Design an enzyme around this catalytic site. Structure first.
Site, PDB file in Angstrom:
ATOM      1  N   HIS A  78     -59.793  96.439  67.227  1.00  0.00           N
ATOM      2  CA  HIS A  78     -59.372  96.383  65.830  1.00  0.00           C
ATOM      3  C   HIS A  78     -58.451  95.186  65.603  1.00  0.00           C
ATOM      4  O   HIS A  78     -57.615  94.900  66.465  1.00  0.00           O
ATOM      5  CB  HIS A  78     -58.649  97.698  65.474  1.00  0.00           C
TER       6      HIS A  78
HETATM    7  C1  LIG Z   1     -47.346  92.143  65.181  1.00  0.00           C
HETATM    8  C2  LIG Z   1     -48.250  93.220  65.712  1.00  0.00           C
HETATM    9  C3  LIG Z   1     -49.611  93.039  65.770  1.00  0.00           C
HETATM   10  C4  LIG Z   1     -50.491  94.019  66.251  1.00  0.00           C
HETATM   11  N1  LIG Z   1     -51.825  93.765  66.289  1.00  0.00           N
HETATM   12  C5  LIG Z   1     -52.616  94.682  66.739  1.00  0.00           C
HETATM   13  C6  LIG Z   1     -54.084  94.434  66.768  1.00  0.00           C
HETATM   14  O1  LIG Z   1     -54.621  93.420  66.390  1.00  0.00           O
HETATM   15  N2  LIG Z   1     -54.807  95.474  67.244  1.00  0.00           N
HETATM   16  C7  LIG Z   1     -54.309  96.687  67.698  1.00  0.00           C
HETATM   17  O2  LIG Z   1     -55.117  97.497  68.114  1.00  0.00           O
HETATM   18  N3  LIG Z   1     -52.964  96.896  67.667  1.00  0.00           N
HETATM   19  C8  LIG Z   1     -52.165  95.969  67.205  1.00  0.00           C
HETATM   20  N4  LIG Z   1     -50.816  96.197  67.165  1.00  0.00           N
HETATM   21  C9  LIG Z   1     -50.286  97.481  67.640  1.00  0.00           C
HETATM   22  C10 LIG Z   1     -50.433  98.592  66.602  1.00  0.00           C
HETATM   23  O3  LIG Z   1     -49.805  98.177  65.421  1.00  0.00           O
HETATM   24  C11 LIG Z   1     -49.838  99.895  67.172  1.00  0.00           C
HETATM   25  O4  LIG Z   1     -50.422 100.136  68.446  1.00  0.00           O
HETATM   26  C12 LIG Z   1     -50.101 101.113  66.273  1.00  0.00           C
HETATM   27  O5  LIG Z   1     -49.713 100.804  64.940  1.00  0.00           O
HETATM   28  C13 LIG Z   1     -49.329 102.304  66.824  1.00  0.00           C
HETATM   29  O6  LIG Z   1     -49.744 103.457  66.120  1.00  0.00           O
HETATM   30  P1  LIG Z   1     -48.839 104.791  66.204  1.00  0.00           P
HETATM   31  O7  LIG Z   1     -49.654 105.907  65.656  1.00  0.00           O
HETATM   32  O8  LIG Z   1     -48.184 104.868  67.540  1.00  0.00           O
HETATM   33  O9  LIG Z   1     -47.597 104.468  65.168  1.00  0.00           O
HETATM   34  P2  LIG Z   1     -47.394 103.399  63.980  1.00  0.00           P
HETATM   35  O10 LIG Z   1     -48.739 102.948  63.503  1.00  0.00           O
HETATM   36  O11 LIG Z   1     -46.319 102.428  64.380  1.00  0.00           O
HETATM   37  O12 LIG Z   1     -46.652 104.300  62.849  1.00  0.00           O
HETATM   38  C14 LIG Z   1     -45.358 104.796  63.099  1.00  0.00           C
HETATM   39  C15 LIG Z   1     -44.762 105.116  61.739  1.00  0.00           C
HETATM   40  O13 LIG Z   1     -43.620 105.947  61.956  1.00  0.00           O
HETATM   41  C16 LIG Z   1     -42.695 105.725  60.935  1.00  0.00           C
HETATM   42  N5  LIG Z   1     -41.470 106.280  61.440  1.00  0.00           N
HETATM   43  C17 LIG Z   1     -40.745 105.826  62.510  1.00  0.00           C
HETATM   44  N6  LIG Z   1     -39.708 106.571  62.766  1.00  0.00           N
HETATM   45  C18 LIG Z   1     -39.741 107.580  61.831  1.00  0.00           C
HETATM   46  C19 LIG Z   1     -38.917 108.699  61.555  1.00  0.00           C
HETATM   47  N7  LIG Z   1     -37.832 109.004  62.255  1.00  0.00           N
HETATM   48  N8  LIG Z   1     -39.254 109.508  60.542  1.00  0.00           N
HETATM   49  C20 LIG Z   1     -40.341 109.232  59.829  1.00  0.00           C
HETATM   50  N9  LIG Z   1     -41.182 108.226  59.989  1.00  0.00           N
HETATM   51  C21 LIG Z   1     -40.842 107.422  61.001  1.00  0.00           C
HETATM   52  C22 LIG Z   1     -42.770 104.214  60.753  1.00  0.00           C
HETATM   53  O14 LIG Z   1     -42.313 103.811  59.513  1.00  0.00           O
HETATM   54  C23 LIG Z   1     -44.269 103.914  60.939  1.00  0.00           C
HETATM   55  O15 LIG Z   1     -44.979 103.866  59.720  1.00  0.00           O
HETATM   56  C24 LIG Z   1     -49.956  95.238  66.695  1.00  0.00           C
HETATM   57  C25 LIG Z   1     -48.570  95.425  66.623  1.00  0.00           C
HETATM   58  C26 LIG Z   1     -47.723  94.455  66.148  1.00  0.00           C
HETATM   59  C27 LIG Z   1     -46.249  94.727  66.108  1.00  0.00           C
END
Ligand SMILES: Cc1cc2nc3c(=O)[nH]c(=O)nc-3n(C[C@H](O)[C@H](O)[C@H](O)COP(=O)(O)OP(=O)(O)OC[C@H]3O[C@@H](n4cnc5c(N)ncnc54)[C@H](O)[C@@H]3O)c2cc1C
Ligand SMILES: Cc1cc2nc3c(=O)[nH]c(=O)nc-3n(C[C@H](O)[C@H](O)[C@H](O)COP(=O)(O)OP(=O)(O)OC[C@H]3O[C@@H](n4cnc5c(N)ncnc54)[C@H](O)[C@@H]3O)c2cc1C
Ligand SMILES: c1cc(-c2ccc3c(c2)OCO3)n[nH]1
Ligand SMILES: c1cc(-c2ccc3c(c2)OCO3)n[nH]1
Ligand SMILES: [Br-]
Ligand SMILES: [Br-]
Ligand SMILES: [Br-]
Ligand SMILES: [Br-]
Lengths: 487, 489
Positions: free
Chosen positions: B462
Site C-alpha cells: 500500500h
Molecule cells: C511518513 C510515513 C509514511 C508511511 N508510509 C507507509 C506506506 O507507504 N505503506 C505502509 O504500509 N505503511 C506506511 N506507513 C506506516 C503506517 O502509517 C502505519 O503502519 C499504520 O498507519 C499503523 O496502523 P495502526 O492501526 O497501528 O495505527 P494508526 O494508523 O497510526 O492509527 C492510530 C490512531 O490512534 C490515534 N490515537 C493515538 N493515541 C490515542 C489515544 N490515546 N486515544 C485515542 N486515539 C488515539 C491517533 O490519532 C491515530 O489516528 C507510514 C508511516 C509514516 C509515519
C-alpha cells in the site's frame, strides 16, 4: 456511561478494520476513539490513522509530485521541447492539493460512522481505567476532564506509533515527518536524519521541490542506508539518489543542533563536522504509542522494546484486551495492521480463530527510483538454509539510455532455497517495482520455485519479465558463506 | 563454391528463430545456420536480423508510446504544483524517430556480433526457401528465379519467418501505409486515420495523438461496434472512453471503401456508410498474416491451415518429419515471448532429450495504449461457456493521484474471473498505469493454479493499484450456465 461489545482506542488502519468488521459482519456494538476528526496540527494523526493523515496516502501523492522533476527532464530524450528556465515547483500547491485529498478521506470516514449501525465514534484521548472500562478525556493528561466512560466486553489497543527523537542538545529545533507534511515553504537546505524509508522518501520529495541553490543531505549513523533491504539494492539506491543531487552522509550522526541568527539550524555531528540547514527532519525510527493509555491501571505487559506484548492472536496478558498494528512493534505497515484487525475480530466474534502471517509480506519504498520487495534477503536466508541461490539481473533499461538518466539501473533479485528451488525472497529496484511485487506476494503463498517463474511466459517489453528470465544463479551461500560456485 | 551443412537451418532470424538457433548451438553443441533478408532495421524490408519485435514491433513501439506518455505527464504535473510555459511546448517527432532508430540499430549490431563470435551459429543474408526436405536455398530476393547465394544442407529445418500486415483490396489502397511505414514517417501527420480495432491501431493512435502538430486530429475507425475484440469487455468500453477523453475520435461500425487524393495531395477517405474524412496518412492495421508465400512450401509438401498458417502439432512439427514451425507463421498467438518459448521448447525436444510443449493458455500479455492494459487468462464470457458457475470480482475507480492530476477519466479497472465451484482464477484483466508490469507475476500465479483465496490472503502493498487484486473477497456478479446475474439463485 455506555455499553459496548468492542471499544477500539485509535481510529486508524487496524482500528477501523476491526471496528467496521465487528459491527457489520458480526452485528456487534462498537465504539472507536480518536483524538482528532481531521488531519494536521496539533495532533497530526486523526480519524483514519497515521497512513491516511500523515503517512502512506499523503507521502505517495508528494512522491508522485516529486517524480515530475525527472519526467520533465527525461522527456527531452523523446523529443519534447519547452522552456526549461520557466519551470518551477510550487510546493504550496502540492501541499494544498494534498490537504484537500486527505480532508476528503476524513469526511468520508465521518459519514461511514453516521451510516453504520453499531459503530460509534468518540473524540478524545482513551485510556484504560479498568479491565472492562475505557475512559475518554479532553487531553492526553490523565487528570483532564472525563468526557465518556465506555464499558467493554473487549478492548482493542490500536494507537499506532510516533516519531522517535534522540536525546541530544537542541532536539527541539528539529522536526519529524509529522511537521514535514505542513511546512509553509519547501526548505532550501534540509538534512534528513536516518537511513530508513521515511528519511529516504522525504529526501526525494525535498530534492524535487527545493528552491534555486537548494541542497538535500541525508545522514545515517552506520555505513549503508536502508538496513533490512537487499544489499545490492541498498548500494544502488544510494548511487541513484546521489546521481539526482542528494548528498548521502554515512557514518555520521548529529550530536547537537543550535539556532542561527537567521533562523537556520547549525548541526554538529559526532565526528566534529558541521552543517547549516533550514530544516532538520529526524526520521530515525518510530516507537509504539503506549504512554497515554495508562496500561499500569490494568497491568498490560510491554516488551523490552516498548510494544504491547501479544500472542499470535493479538491477545495481551490481560483477558479481553487486545493489541494490533504499530503498537505491537512488529511490522509497521498499514496492510499488516488491517490484516491483524480483521483476524482479531474473526477470532473473537466468529467461530474461527485466525492469525496474521507476518512472513512473506510484500512492501515498498517510494524512493526515486522505488523499491518493491517480498520475503527474505539473502543473508537472512543464509542463516536458515544450508544452500541459498541468488539470481540477479541489473541493467539500465533502454528507455533510460534515451531519457538521459543512465544511472537508473533496474535491479531484480530472486533468493531461493537451492536445495529445492523454493523462492524465499524477491527484491526489485526501478520504475514500477512496487506494482510488480504485489502478485509476487501471491506467488510465495503457492510455494513457487524459481522454475515456476522461469517457465512462465514473459510479458514484453516490461521490467517485470526479468523475473521470468533468470535460469542460472549468479552466486550462492553455503553454510552461511558467500561463494560464486558451489563446492 | 560449396554448399555448407548444418544440424539445423533456421529461416528467419527473429524472436523465435534466434532463441532456437542460439540454444541449439550453445546448449547442445549443434551446428546452426540462420537466414534473414536484412542486417539492420527499416526499408526496404522493415524487419531484419532480430525479428519483427526488435525492428518494427514491440521494442520501437514501446519507446514511442513512452515518448507519447509525456504529453500526459507534462499536463498532469500542474496538479502537483509544476509550473512552466505551456505555450513553449513542442513534440519533436524527428528527434523521437532518430532516438528510436539508434537504439534499434544498436541491437542489430549486437546481434551481428553474436554471429561473428559464436561457435556453430552462422548467419546468412538473403531469402530462404525450401528446395527439398534437407536443402534450404538462399536467394538474392523473394523471387524464386533470383540468383542463388547459398545452399544450406539441413538435418532439421525451422520455419520462423513471422507475419506481415494485411492490406484490404479497396480502390486507392496504394495511398495507405501499414505500421512498417509509420515507424519511418519523416514528419508526424497532422491528420491520421488508423484503421483497425486491434492493439496496433490503438497503440499508434496514442502515439500520433501525442506528437501531432498544432491543430491535428487522430481518428481511429473500426468496422464493428467495439474495439479490441478478445479483451475484457469492461476494459474495451473503458479504453474507448479514455482514448476519446484524450482527443482521439473513435469511429465504430465504419470501414473505408476507397481512398483518393485531393488536389492538395491529402487523402480523401470514403467509408462504406458514405461518410468522408480528409487525412494526411491512412495507416491500415486490420490484421497480420503469416509469411509463407516466399518459402516455396509446395516443394516439400508442408501443409498450411485453412487460415494460411503452417500447420503444427503441439511439438511444433509440420507434416514433414524434420521440418518445424514456430512463432507468427503458425498463426496462433502472435507474441514475441510465445515464439521464444516455442523455440526453446523445440530445441530441448529435438536436441536435448527433454521433450516439452509450449503452454498457450494463461499467457500474460499487454496493450500499451494510453493508459495500458495487462491481461492473463480467460475473459468472462469465454469462461462462462466452459464452466457452470463463473464469478467476477471487479474494482473500478479513478485513483486518487488522477483526482489531483486532473485526468479524472483515468479509471483503473481490476477484474478477476474464477471458476466459482472451486475458486480457481481463470483470468485477470487490468486497465491503468502499470498494468503491464502488474500482470507479469499474475502469470506465474495462474500457472500455479492460484485461487481467489490465495489472492485475498496475500497482504497488500500500500498504496498501489496492484493491491486491489488482493482485497477482493465477494463476487460483483456471476455467470450460471451462461447467464449473467448479480446473485446466485
Ligand atoms: C511518513 C510515513 C509514511 C508511511 N508510509 C507507509 C506506506 O507507504 N505503506 C505502509 O504500509 N505503511 C506506511 N506507513 C506506516 C503506517 O502509517 C502505519 O503502519 C499504520 O498507519 C499503523 O496502523 P495502526 O492501526 O497501528 O495505527 P494508526 O494508523 O497510526 O492509527 C492510530 C490512531 O490512534 C490515534 N490515537 C493515538 N493515541 C490515542 C489515544 N490515546 N486515544 C485515542 N486515539 C488515539 C491517533 O490519532 C491515530 O489516528 C507510514 C508511516 C509514516 C509515519
Ligand atoms: C507494430 C507491432 C507491435 C508489436 N508489439 C508487440 C509487443 O508489444 N509484444 C509482443 O509480445 N509482441 C508484439 N508484436 C508481435 C511480435 O513482434 C511477434 O509476435 C514476433 O516478432 C514473432 O516472432 P517470430 O519469431 O514468429 O518472427 P519475427 O520476429 O517476425 O521474425 C521473422 C524474421 O524472418 C525474416 N524473414 C521473413 N521471410 C524470410 C525469408 N523468406 N527468408 C529469410 N528471412 C525471412 C524477417 O525479416 C524477420 O526478421 C508486435 C508486432 C507488431 C507488428
Ligand atoms: C526546479 C526543478 C526544475 C526543473 C526540473 C526539470 C526540468 C527543468 C527544470 O528543465 C527541464 O527539465 N526547475 N526548478
Ligand atoms: C502538443 C501537446 C502539447 C502540450 C502537452 C502538455 C502540456 C502542454 C502542452 O502545456 C502544459 O502541459 N503541446 N503540443
Ligand atoms: Br541515523
Ligand atoms: Br550498515
Ligand atoms: Br517534428
Ligand atoms: Br477468500
Amino acid at each position: 456511561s455506555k455499553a459496548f461489545d468492542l471499544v477500539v482506542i485509535g481510529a486508524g488502519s487496524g482500528g477501523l478494520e476491526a471496528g467496521w468488521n465487528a459491527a457489520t459482519l458480526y452485528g456487534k456494538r462498537v465504539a472507536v476513539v480518536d483524538v482528532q476528526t481531521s488531519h494536521g496540527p496539533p495532533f497530526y494523526a486523526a480519524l483514519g490513522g497515521t497512513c491516511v493523515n500523515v503517512g502512506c496516502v499523503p507521502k505517495k501523492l508528494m512522491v508522485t509530485g516529486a517524480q515530475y522533476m525527472d519526467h520533465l527532464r527525461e522527456s527531452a530524450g523523446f523529443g519534447w521541447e519547452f522552456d526549461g528556465s520557466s519551470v518551477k515547483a510550487n510546493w504550496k500547491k502540492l501541499i494544498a492539493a494534498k490537504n484537500e485529498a486527505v480532508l476528503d478521506i476524513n469526511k468520508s470516514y465521518e459519514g461511514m460512522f453516521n451510516d453504520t449501525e453499531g459503530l460509534d465514534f468518540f473524540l478524545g484521548w482513551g485510556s484504560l481505567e479498568s479491565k472492562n472500562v475505557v475512559v475518554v478525556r479532553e487531553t492526553a493528561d490523565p487528570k483532564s476532564a472525563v468526557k465518556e466512560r465506555l464499558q467493554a466486553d473487549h478492548i482493542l489497543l490500536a494507537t499506532g506509533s510516533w516519531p522517535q527523537m534522540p536525546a541530544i542538545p537542541g532536539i527541539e529545533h528539529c522536526i519529524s515527518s509529522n511537521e514535514a507534511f505542513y511546512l509553509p515553504e519547501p526548505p532550501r537546505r534540509v538534512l534528513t536524519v536516518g537511513g530508513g524509508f521515511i528519511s529516504v522518501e522525504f529526501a526525494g520529495i525535498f530534492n524535487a521541490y527545493k528552491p534555486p541553490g537548494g541542497k538535500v543531505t541525508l545522514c545515517y549513523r552506520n555505513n549503508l542506508i536502508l538496513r533490512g533491504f537487499d544489499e545490492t539494492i541498498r548500494e544502488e539506491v544510494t548511487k541513484q539518489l546521489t546521481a539526482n543531487g542528494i548528498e548521502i552522509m554515512t557514518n555520521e550522526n548529529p550530536a547537537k543542533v543550535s539556532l542561527n541568527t537567521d533562523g537556520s539550524k547549525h548541526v554538529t555531528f559526532e565526528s566534529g563536522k558541521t552543517l547549516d540547514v533550514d530544516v532538520v527532519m529526524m526520521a530515525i525510527g518510530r516507537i509504539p504509542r503506549t504512554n497515554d493509555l495508562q496500561l499500569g491501571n490494568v497491568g498490560v505487559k510491554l516488551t523490552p522494546k516498548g510494544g504491547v506484548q501479544v500472542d499470535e492472536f493479538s491477545r495481551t496478558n490481560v483477558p479481553n484486551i487486545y493489541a494490533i498494528g504499530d503498537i505491537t512493534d512488529r511490522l509497521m505497515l498499514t496492510p499488516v495492521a488491517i490484516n491483524e484487525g480483521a483476524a482479531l475480530v474473526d477470532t473473537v466474534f466468529g467461530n474461527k480463530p485466525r492469525k496474521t502471517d507476518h512472513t512473506r509480506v510484500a512492501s515498498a519504498v517510494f524512493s526515486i527510483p522505488p523499491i518493491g520487495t517480498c520475503g527474505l534477503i539473502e543473508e537472512v536466508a543464509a542463516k536458515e538454509f544450508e544452500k541459498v541461490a541468488v539470481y540477479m539481473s541489473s541493467f539500465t533499461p533502454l528507455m533510460h539510455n534515451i531519457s538521459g538518466s543512465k544511472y537508473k539501473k533496474f535491479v531484480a533479485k530472486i533468493v531461493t532455497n537451492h536445495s529445492d528451488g523454493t523462492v524465499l525472497g524477491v527484491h526489485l529496484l526501478g520504475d514500477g517495482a512496487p506494482e510488480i511485487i504485489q502478485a509476487v506476494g501471491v506467488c510465495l503463498r503457492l510455494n513457487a520455485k524459481i522454475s515456476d517463474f522461469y517457465n512462465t511466459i514473459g510479458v514484453h517489453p516490461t521490467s517485470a519479465e526479468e523475473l521470468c528470465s533468470m535460469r542460472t544463479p549468479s552466486y550462492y551461500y553455503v553454510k552461511g558463506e558467500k561463494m560464486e560456485k558451489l563446492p
